[PDB]
Design a protein around this ligand. Structure first.
Ligand SMILES: Nc1ncnc2c1ncn2[C@@H]1O[C@H](COP(=O)(O)CP(=O)(O)OP(=O)(O)O)[C@@H](O)[C@H]1O
Ligand SMILES: Nc1nc2c(ncn2[C@@H]2O[C@H](COP(=O)(O)OP(=O)(O)O)[C@@H](O)[C@H]2O)c(=O)[nH]1
Length: 610
């Protein structure tokens, strides 16, 4: 198997002997232009940025740094003057603006963006691919200032705050001090070295005694895990990981394990195999960060450093649930059990017994400490690994290939019919339109027609609003009565942002029409709007923690304020994630584009209100 052949290594520093690290000096003109674009964006009433000034307490000259932070969604515009996440600027003693800290570019999980679809990665990246272990603590940035100060920052901050004994950046600096003393070097030596390289060192602080995350980093493992070195310039240029490991050795950092894989299809197979257990090389692994080169035009053009991530769902999602349930337990709140119901109830009974036997544990858990150990104690009590515990609840979804019914929960104009047509174009799935059924006994006849479509199709789009809970109850009950293996998947159009929903849907129906039967008989815009407001008023959100929506096999949240092209890719990506043998891969962006274009050209209802 691929996971057995490929082992993560922290022994690549020898492979870096002789190699030259990337280096670009800061251009005063370009840096000033960046700072002016940021400053201007910070003063404005799309592209927005927050500017926060911090004194550098260890600076002998009193240096200050400006930390810049975009709105998180801005990273998907093409507008930004830099895509750094983590960005601090400063001024030299002689008044030159400089980049003091340059984090990685913001990067995304598989299927989170167009660029991190496997279909796009396969076309537009080149290897060899660096698979770096994603250690989970907090990020620490380290660089050298002109006055010789070693600057240490967390993702967006630096220095001490009086509202905590030890900030994240100060904890990182204290770890740095100990690691440098361990090798006979000094903070000013490291500062001079990083400034000579015009670079930011990027490490993960992992230390249970400071703050617990998901996996334990006890005293034997606690420290700064160096995983990157970036150039302090507006574009993104990062060190090859063998040189990162060599730098870790020279300056006393812990190393981030690395695997190099040449072929993107082996990368994909390796990751999906590790995802079966969340473990590799006999340790738990929360994920990988994959580093390669990417071009904007597939196959040609210039290539730039580019990352994507692959985070493993289990057992870490169950572990996060257990942590939250534990906090609910000691505070007297209701534990919220979403998934893994049987083993989580056992975990809570176990935790209650431990708490009754040792009251002082609650004061540890109050401070978010000891909770990893409680989970490991419980797994020991069960003689189970977490991955086994997370597989106790299993609805057989991994094996599903057919008999899926997609059930919109929506109001008029959310794009249901458009989505159904697009899915038929892409996958050949069935589509039953309640709008085409007239007369009495409509809900049982609709339901039976939906069922019977499974004779010729692996899935069927059950096209009805289902705005009221009683309609989901009816459909759930009648399907389960007549078809013992059908899985019902709700496509819940979330109506939280109700006045934006109203505008978007009403624009669609008024301007481009809708075949809902009441719309097709509406003879003016006021009748249309009143009909639409009727469904809004009657609408009951999907709530999979209560009856009847609890009966759905899965719920996929969609956004009626978003275009149908975006809701289409959410549907497919989520179906793939939930039922990987049903939707085996997400089609390329171009195919979903063509599906939606076909949907709105072939499906054009008449407007009887004009
Ligand atoms: N080998 C590695 N390469 C890159 N980043 C790594 C890494 N090992 C750990 N990381 C961490 O992984 C982070 C990005 O992955 P995510 O955990 O998904 C960001 P997030 O948790 O969604 O928001 P947050 O960073 O503000 O908490 C980086 O910011 C860095 O702290
Ligand atoms: N411009 C635009 N029009 C859309 C989009 N999605 C749906 N429509 C149109 O909105 C109208 C109602 O869409 P429909 O799929 O019938 O919504 P339904 O009532 O929820 O089934 C149709 O004329 C669609 O072509 C979209 O993403 N963009």
């Amino acid at each position: 198997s691929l996971a057995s052949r490929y082992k993560a290594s922290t022994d690549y520093a020898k492979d870096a002997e002789g190699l030259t690290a990337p280096y670009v000096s800061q251009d005063p003109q370009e840096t000033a232009a960046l700072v002016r674009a940021l400053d201007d964006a910070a003063k404005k009433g799309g592209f927005s940025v927050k500017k926060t000034r911090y004194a550098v307490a260890s600076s002998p000259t009193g240096a200050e740094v400006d930390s810049w932070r975009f709105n998180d969604w801005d990273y998907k515009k093409p507008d930004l003057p830099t895509y750094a996440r983590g960005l601090f600027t400063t001024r030299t003693q002689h008044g030159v603006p400089e980049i003091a800290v340059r984090g990685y570019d913001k990067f995304f999980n598989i299927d989170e963006t167009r660029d991190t679809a496997w279909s796009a990665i396969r076309e537009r990246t080149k290897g060899p691919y660096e698979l770096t272990l994603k250690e989970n603590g907090c990020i620490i940035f380290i660089s050298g200032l002109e006055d010789g100060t070693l600057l240490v920052c967390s993702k967006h901050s630096t220095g001490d705050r009086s509202d905590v004994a030890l900030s994240h950046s100060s904890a990182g600096e204290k770890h740095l001090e100990a690691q440098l003393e361990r090798i006979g070097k000094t903070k000013e030596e490291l500062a001079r070295e990083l400034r000579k390289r015009n670079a930011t060192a990027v490490a993960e602080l992992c230390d249970d005694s400071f703050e617990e995350h998901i996996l334990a980093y006890g005293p034997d493992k606690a420290g700064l895990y160096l995983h990157g070195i970036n150039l302090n310039i507006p574009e993104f240029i990062t060190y090859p990981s063998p040189l990162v490991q060599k730098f870790a050795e020279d300056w006393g950092f812990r190393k981030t394990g690395l695997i190099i894989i040449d072929n993107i299809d082996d990368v994909k197979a390796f990751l999906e195999e590790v995802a079966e257990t969340g473990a590799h090389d006999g340790r738990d692994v929360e994920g990988f960060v994959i580093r390669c080169k990417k071009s904007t035009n597939p196959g040609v053009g210039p290539y730039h450093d580019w990352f994507f991530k692959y985070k493993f769902e289990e057992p870490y999602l169950m572990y996060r649930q257990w942590r939250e349930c534990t906090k609910a337990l000691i505070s007297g709140k209701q534990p919220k059990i979403k998934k893994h119901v049987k083993i989580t109830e056992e975990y809570l009974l176990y935790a209650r017994k431990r708490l009754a036997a040792d009251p002082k544990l609650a004061k540890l858990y109050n401070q978010n400490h000891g909770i990893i150990k409680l989970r490991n104690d419980f797994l020991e009590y069960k003689n189970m690994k977490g991955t086994d515990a997370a597989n106790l609840e299993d609805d057989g979804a991994a094996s599903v290939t057919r008999d899926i019914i997609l059930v919109p929960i929506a109001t008029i104009g959310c794009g249901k019919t458009t989505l159904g047509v697009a899915l038929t174009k892409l996958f050949g799935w069935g589509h039953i339109q309640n709008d085409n059924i007239t007369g009495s006994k409509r809900p049982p006849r609709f339901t039976k027609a939906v069922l019977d479509e499974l004779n010729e199709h692996p899935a069927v789009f059950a096209d009805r609003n289902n705005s009221m809970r009683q309609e989901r109850k009816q459909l759930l009950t009648d399907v389960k009565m007549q078809h013992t293996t059908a899985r019902l998947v709700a496509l819940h159009f979330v109506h939280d942002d109700i006045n934006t929903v109203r505008k978007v849907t009403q624009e669609r129906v008024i301007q481009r029409g809708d075949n809902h039967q009441t719309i097709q008989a509406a003879t003016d815009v006021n009748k249309v709007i009143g009909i639409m407001e009727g469904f809004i008023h009657r609408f009951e959100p999907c709530d999979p923690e209560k009856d009847p929506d609890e009966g759905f096999d899965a719920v996929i949240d969609l956004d009626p304020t978003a275009g149908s092209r975006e809701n289409l890719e959410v549907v497919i990506r989520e179906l793939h994630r939930l039922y990987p043998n049903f939707v085996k891969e997400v089609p390329p962006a171009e195919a979903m584009d063509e599906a939606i274009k076909f949907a709105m050209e072939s499906y054009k209802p008449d407007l009887r209100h004009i």
